[PDB]
Design a protein around this ligand. Structure first.
Ligand SMILES: NC(=O)c1c(OCc2c(F)cc(Br)cc2F)nsc1NC(=O)NCCCCN1CCCC1
Ligand SMILES: CCCCCCCCO[C@@H]1O[C@H](CO)[C@@H](O)[C@H](O)[C@H]1O
Length: 334
């Protein structure tokens, strides 16, 4: 039934964890301990949520985190090994712990600013897209994909996480608060990430927000005619007007001696017009990933309720709902 729990002090707070989890050790600030799940053999990250039910917006966040994590069932996407609470009733619920695979390094810790081989980039980017295809099939946009959101083990096996200047991988529309994003915001991010692995260099290293935008326009050129027609705001329309022409650079010269398949994929991801960017499903089918591509093991998600978290409710209802998600949780198939 319910497992036995044990208590120990950690991070200015008492952690009450099941028995099966051992040698907890703080490895970040909620706050996280690294631990060994003796039950399963795995190294895990165990997250104690700081103040999950503080406000309407915290409680809302808790419930939405749990619900997304519980929905994420894919090799290339972080997923939940366990969720627990000491509480033996709702009356007494306030503490939430999440459990997932301990990961030792992210894509800065692999990248070491050294350029990777084509075959390695192929593999890493393949996995990102495999993972993205699936997130996107759930009508989930990630919105802030970047090396530090990309977890990787010693064998180059990758997982997308939700958690370096954090703006370098952002879709330009996000930085212009465009507010009706396509899924292809993530594709922009992958493009910048891919470019970086191949070259060893940040592709758009903006020092500030506008410089960032400036570096991008150097690469792709200025909004062409068909993109310019789409600017809702007049003044942008009008400012963007007041720029001069500058034509896209030839990526082949920007990416000197890269596999031309990679260049060609870079050219389909790094299109200003989000409506013209290659999708993840399409990019997986790109001849660049011929060695990895398999259309029968690149699985979609069950659909997922975006509005069901955007309710206006009272802390007690969020907390009751989160409680129900904690109770109903069934660990993944190992
Ligand atoms: N995943 C992990 O191993 C991890 C982690 O997971 C939090 C966490 C949960 F606890 C539970 C759920 Br559910 C989701 C979730 F994101 N917080 S820190 C950390 N790993 C770590 O500090 N390794 C040693 C330092 C290397 C830098 N690494 C690269 C990747 C992460 C930082
Ligand atoms: C300063 C001009 C550079 C920014 C151009 C960004 C164009 C991004 O693409 C735009 O994204 C929108 C979704 O957010 C779509 O609705 C538009 O149709 C699409 O053209």
């Amino acid at each position: 039934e319910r497992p036995t729990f044990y208590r120990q002090e950690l991070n200015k707070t008492i952690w009450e964890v099941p028995e099966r989890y051992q040698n907890l050790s703080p490895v970040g600030s909620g706050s996280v301990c690294a631990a060994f799940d003796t039950k399963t053999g795995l190294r895990v990250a165990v997250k104690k949520l700081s103040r999950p039910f503080q406000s309407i917006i915290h409680a809302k966040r808790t419930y939405r985190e749990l619900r997304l994590l519980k929905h994420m069932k894919h090799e290339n996407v972080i997923g939940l090994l366990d969720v627990f609470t000491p509480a033996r009733s709702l009356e007494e619920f306030n503490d939430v712990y999440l459990v997932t695979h301990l990961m030792g390094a992210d894509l800065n810790n692999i990248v070491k600013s050294q350029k990777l081989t084509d075959d390695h980039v192929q593999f890493l980017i393949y996995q990102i897209l495999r993972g993205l295809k699936y997130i996107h099939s759930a009508d989930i946009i990630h919105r802030d994909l970047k090396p530090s959101n990309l977890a990787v083990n010693e064998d180059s096996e990758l997982k997308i996480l939700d958690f370096v200047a954090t703006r370098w991988y952002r879709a330009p529309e996000i930085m212009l608060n465009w507010m009706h994003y396509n899924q292809t915001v993530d594709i922009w991010s992958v493009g910048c990430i891919m470019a970086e692995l191949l070259t060893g260099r940040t592709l758009f290293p903006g020092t500030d927000h506008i410089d960032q935008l400036k570096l991008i326009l150097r690469l792709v050129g200025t909004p062409g005619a068909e993109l310019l027609k789409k600017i809702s705001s007049e003044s942008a329309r009008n400012y963007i007007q007041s720029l001069t022409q500058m034509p896209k650079m030839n990526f082949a010269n920007v990416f000197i001696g890269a596999n031309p398949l990679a260049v060609d994929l870079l050219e389909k991801m790094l299109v200003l017009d989000s409506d013209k960017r290659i999708t993840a499903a399409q990019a997986l089918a790109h001849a660049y990933f011929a060695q990895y591509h398999d259309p029968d093991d690149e699985p979609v998600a069950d659909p997922y309720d975006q509005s069901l978290e955007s309710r206006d409710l009272l802390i007690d209802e969020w907390k009751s709902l989160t409680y129900d998600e904690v109770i109903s949780f069934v660990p993944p198939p190992l």
